[PDB]
Enzyme design. Structure first.
Site, PDB file in Angstrom:
ATOM      1  N   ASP A  97      33.129  70.524  61.950  1.00 52.78           N
ATOM      2  CA  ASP A  97      33.007  71.974  61.683  1.00 52.78           C
ATOM      3  C   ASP A  97      34.377  72.634  61.568  1.00 52.78           C
ATOM      4  OD1 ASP A  97      30.449  71.097  63.383  1.00 52.78           O
ATOM      5  OD2 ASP A  97      29.767  72.683  62.031  1.00 52.78           O
ATOM      6  N   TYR A 121      24.501  62.942  62.103  1.00 50.00           N
ATOM      7  CA  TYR A 121      23.059  62.717  62.025  1.00 50.00           C
ATOM      8  C   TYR A 121      22.706  61.242  62.089  1.00 50.00           C
ATOM      9  CZ  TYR A 121      22.316  67.581  61.502  1.00 50.00           C
ATOM     10  OH  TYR A 121      22.163  68.931  61.749  1.00 50.00           O
TER      11      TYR A 121
END
Ligand SMILES: [Ca+2]
Ligand SMILES: [Ca+2]
Ligand SMILES: [Cu+2]
Ligand SMILES: [Cu+2]
Lengths: 720, 718
Positions: A378, A364
């Site tokens: 992930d 982000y």
């Protein structure tokens, strides 16, 4: 003894269609296409007759079948899609029994403790040469089967190797400084620790929240900032972001902005609460499940294969047209596609030893207290195989798919069978080729692709990966993203409010009081291509405009600059989609004397803006730790323990132990066993069309045969 | 009574017999019919139909009434096609209108014998009036007119005819314009070569024993300021030659370094250029399967047994929230018009007209047979005229509906193109999904509506897909297949002496055959009207900026946003890491963001991408065709600016297309804009593409960007 047909068949997962005019049931599950008439003594399975002792009974508009009907019909043998494996393939994943055995072997050492968890239990890569010899020559693999068993003992990682043939522990190695991935029980621990904190409940109360039992937590890894985050490096920590449950099924739409708890998982306590300014919780109901919507009434469309499939699945081996490959599941990276060959007029030619997801990251772009550290690795940090999302039959894959179940170990060492883990399906893909010569009969053939699809959901986002086998030798790898955006609570309702400009500095205003914070999706694939053999070279071909030196009116020509890339540092590069990058076999040539090759295309398109690298300054720690983010093509020397672009233990890593490390030294890439890594990324700037749920967005990559063959590969078999 | 299998096959329907169920399934376009022998009723798209005469079995063959096809397929139970009571004003000229326009111009004393027609097309009514028809049902007041473009030998004349009043409105010779290549020019070139003793002698020198086996292909010559030796006012074509060896693939047998220049008015060869002799590659290389056997495949069908979700009313297509108008043009093919999205009951403008603008396939080799070679497929050859009829089930999926379309041929006679355009719905993965941990899954299926058209110009076949997504996105994809243009060379393999020189400008893809390097460059003209006429061009460039908010981050992800107010700045290279929006600064979504569409001229491809033109900027083709070198253009709406290469690009001396349209400093701020997207590939050949090239694709996208207030596929609120 009879059971209601409609209900029993739906439990079982078959599609049931009743045709009142024809007095005909059509039943479809996976590779079985079944026709049966009430009262008939025979059914049809994949075009073949099957005797039934007990016919389907219709009775006051309700159908009833035998207690044995489902097994008699669907397990008859007339559906030939699945076949029993003669000799077990050496890359077959660990079975349930092998998993239980590995867990007993380690539990039999003095060092095991009842809080000890299992981050990964997986087959230990057998010798590559032997595996290829099994696939191509049927040479049995003599070395015994082993499992890697990775344990988390409180906060310490231990790697054990077990021998399964001889039933003994072969090694037991503590890995100092390594942090473990996030395990399933950490989600509940975090939520419980927050529920029991008096301090957290008071913090929550001053931000408007009356009932603290409605607070939903989500665990995030904290990364590494050389102490600027004020977080001790030795401890097992997670950060915790909070949302309010308002009963709409979408807690993600109700962020509690600027409140972060740091939880120590050994102590089971909140060790720090970071608190920023108070932003009222966005409260409006924003369900994504349709509870507030009118159902569409769409006409049906079915894709049907009424004589069965063109592929055969023998154990984990898939055979389809000229392709053969092995398909297995791993708890960290998901599907592994192995020992991929192409049958070229009777000779199986090597294309790829192993391909899989390498790793991925969603980082982000916002510097605020709830965001600055936020980056989902992930697979590495959460275990994407473990978080496999079962395929919703006919929606997540087409109506003509076969859905495979897959078995892995859970974090306590117990086998878990993931239902509908992977979809396999053939699809029409336009004309394979066409030529309409003026005044002549047309020539057209249809293109068919075989797709292997897998979906994994990590928190808010859902990722879809397609491995696409083209009949003509091309392989596609596509990655799709859907799910619910990670949003920032803000004070602006519209872009006309006083705070709008500041509120949208790092993302778009996509609903009242809700900003979709800008971020990237970055996927990396590890592809151990063996182009018609082990020994390969990386070749560059740059199309260029050159002055015409040949005479006549033209000032310029189109030529190519061709050069070998003989060392690893130069192989790690940005991909210009106007250039050609080949992995060539300098030892084997096609009929024209050109080296047999595959063209590597890390960027073949996408539906979001493309990332040309990492959207981080080069002095960011995330940048330093994760080199894989900033180049699109890497080539390294084969090594069975170099598997992850982010490194083996990325949680709070202080340096790059992945592709940064693997490509660092310069050994030769000339005529040797190469491994290709492709990074492809997007920069996601949000829009209102993506909220409250994001329509699936895709990126595409390709591997294409380049003078691997001698002619159009789909022309067909030569009649002379 | 007539025999069913024979009758239905002549009608173009698929017939399946199921012996277990004793059931015929009959499929054609939007009709899915079930009928049992002896039954008094049938099913058409899920609905019962009484039959006058049951299907009868005689000797295990089915017989039907001679009225069966009319009664069943034209029952009205197939609702796919509906009648058009008030015709849309962009409806293409009908067969009768084409004949009438031709009779109007033939009645003028200025019409000369043997005049041909390059184009006979609707003169479009006023844009405002057309939108008011589509949105408010307002009748258009001015009458049906046609543009009639004539070629009188080599002279172009533009006429306009009023079809209601049956009169000539204007007649205007076009000074210095050269006409496109017409069908009779192909046969003239072949005849002229066949009758030249001089050409036969040249051919004989190159080892050809029978000169009647020589196949010609006509090429436009371009413009080189006289450096090619070619007179500017003559109607010329260059002629490249191949040898027919009886394999069905003359393209595989080039006669290298022999070019004839034909003057079409004189009907003579005016120049023969002769370079070094290279033996003709002789080996048979059929592509049509005469020498092959296909592997057996199990069947796959895509079925819609209750009919289609779209309806076709005249040329108006309605599907889900989309409405649009589909027509055919002889030059550019399909035109997609008056495109609206129905947002919770209100039709919102998206696009007034979109179509192929033009395309170019220019080559990279300086030799005598190549230096001028550049196919302007639509402009110079007429891609609509050269539409390739869809091969049912292969060129489009088995659930497609195939439309016939009518245009004028070069003599002015209407020509019905069978299966000219395919329309089909397809499954396209999940529309969205979220599997929340421990909760019930949420998934919905994605459906796309595709309008597919195929055109073939000589050796290459081009496929264009206009793709409507339920969620408001429009895709435009372009596919290329067919036979490569190849150079004859001496090298058999890369080990031979000449191999390095032979492959300087292309790959050796067969013995004695080089696939010369070239580009494929497509340009789409898209008159987007984003929720209205008055729009602006807005750039959003994602950038990394220093962190000024505190805490440990050194950098942040932000956007530089700015308006592009001038046409000259709008003509730009496309960086796929940036966002380019056409925004309506007069209308906002629920969050106060301007309603917009994001324009993506490069959403990917399967061949290497062209960053622009692979030509030095002093090349004549570069100067003539500016559209090749930038990917995004935005201009002010003008009904006469339609082709990126210009109206008359044959031997053009300067850019009369996008180079001219975008030249002037005029405002793009809050005004009627037209977007043009250029996308292209650089095609370096490989053995896998010979003798026939597996279809390669490029992708573009138009995505709604704060046009809506939320996920557009969630559905209407209860
Ligand atoms: Ca390798
Ligand atoms: Ca416009
Ligand atoms: Cu995203
Ligand atoms: Cu090409």
């Amino acid at each position: 003894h009879m059971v209601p047909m409609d209900k029993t068949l739906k439990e079982f997962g078959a599609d049931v269609q009743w045709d009142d005019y024809a007095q005909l049931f059509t039943l479809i599950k996976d590779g079985a296409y079944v026709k049966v008439k009430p009262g008939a003594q025979t059914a049809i399975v994949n075009g073949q007759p099957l005797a039934l002792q007990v016919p389907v009974v219709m009775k006051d508009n309700k159908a009833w079948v035998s207690d044995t009907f489902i097994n008699d019909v669907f397990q008859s043998g007339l559906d030939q899609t699945f076949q029993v494996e003669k000799r077990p393939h050496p890359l077959n994943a660990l079975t349930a029994d092998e998993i239980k055995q590995a867990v007993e072997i380690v539990k039999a050492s003095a060092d095991f403790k009842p809080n000890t968890r299992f981050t990964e239990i997986s087959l230990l890569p057998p010798d590559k040469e032997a595996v290829w010899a099994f696939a191509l020559e049927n040479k049995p693999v003599d070395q015994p089967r082993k499992a890697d068993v990775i344990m988390l003992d409180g906060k310490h990682i231990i790697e054990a190797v077990v021998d399964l043939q001889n039933n003994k522990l072969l090694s037991w190695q503590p890995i100092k400084d390594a942090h473990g991935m996030v395990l399933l029980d950490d989600f509940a621990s975090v939520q419980n620790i927050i529920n029991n904190s008096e301090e957290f409940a008071a913090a929550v109360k001053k931000r408007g929240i009356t009932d603290a039992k409605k607070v939903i937590t989500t665990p995030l890894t904290v990364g590494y900032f050389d102490g600027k985050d004020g977080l001790k490096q030795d401890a097992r920590l997670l950060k915790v972001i909070s949302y309010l449950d308002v009963g709409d099924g979408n807690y993600w739409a109700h962020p509690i902005e600027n409140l972060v708890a740091v939880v120590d998982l050994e102590q089971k306590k909140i060790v720090k609460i970071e608190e920023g300014p108070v932003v009222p919780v966005p409260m409006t109901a924003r369900p994504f499940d349709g509870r507030d919507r009118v159902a569409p009434a769409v006409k049906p469309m079915q894709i049907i294969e009424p004589e069965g499939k063109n592929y055969t699945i023998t154990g984990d081996m898939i055979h389809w047209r000229n392709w053969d490959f092995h398909l297995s599941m791993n708890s960290r990276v998901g599907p592994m596609i192995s020992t991929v060959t192409y049958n070229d007029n009777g000779t199986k030619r090597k294309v790829m030893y192993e391909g899989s997801l390498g790793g991925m990251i969603v980082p982000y772009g916002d510097p605020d207290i709830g965001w600055y550290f936020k980056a989902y690795l992930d697979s590495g940090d959460y275990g994407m195989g473990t978080l496999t999302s079962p395929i919703a039959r006919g929606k997540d894959a087409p109506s003509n798919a076969v859905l495979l179940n897959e078995t892995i170990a859970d974090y306590t060492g117990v086998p878990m069978e993931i239902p509908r883990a992977i979809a396999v399906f053939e699809r029409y893909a336009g004309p394979e080729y066409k030529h309409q010569e003026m005044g002549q009969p047309n020539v057209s053939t249809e293109r068919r692709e075989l797709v292997v699809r897998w979906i994994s959901t990590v928190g808010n986002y859902d990722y879809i990966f397609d491995w696409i086998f083209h009949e003509n030798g091309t392989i596609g790898i596509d990655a799709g993203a859907t799910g619910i955006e990670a949003v920032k609570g803000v004070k602006a309702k519209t872009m006309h409010d006083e705070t709008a400009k500041d509120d949208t500095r790092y993302g778009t205003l996509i609903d009242h009081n809700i900003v979709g914070t800008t971020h990237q999706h970055i996927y990396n694939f590890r592809l151990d291509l063996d182009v018609d053999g082990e020994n390969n070279s990386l070749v560059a071909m740059d199309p260029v405009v050159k002055p015409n030196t040949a005479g006549g009116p033209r000032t310029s020509t189109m030529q190519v600059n061709q050069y070998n890339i003989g060392n690893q540092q130069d192989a790690a590069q940005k991909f210009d989609p106007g250039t050609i990058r080949l992995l060539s076999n300098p030892n084997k040539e096609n009929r024209m004397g050109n080296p047999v090759s595959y063209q590597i295309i890390p960027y073949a398109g996408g539906t979001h803006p493309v990332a040309k690298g990492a959207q981080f300054a080069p002095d960011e720690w995330i940048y330093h730790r994760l080199s894989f983010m900033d180049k699109q093509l890497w080539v390294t020397r084969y090594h069975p323990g170099e598997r992850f672009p982010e490194g083996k233990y990325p949680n709070r890593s202080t340096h790059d132990t992945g592709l940064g490390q693997y490509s660092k030294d310069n050994e030769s890439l000339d005529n040797t066993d190469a491994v290709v890594w492709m990074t492809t990324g997007t920069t996601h700037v949000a829009r209102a069309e993506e909220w409250p749920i994001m329509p699936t967005e895709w990126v595409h990559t390709l591997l294409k045969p380049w003078n691997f063959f001698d002619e159009t590969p789909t022309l067909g078999a030569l009649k002379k």
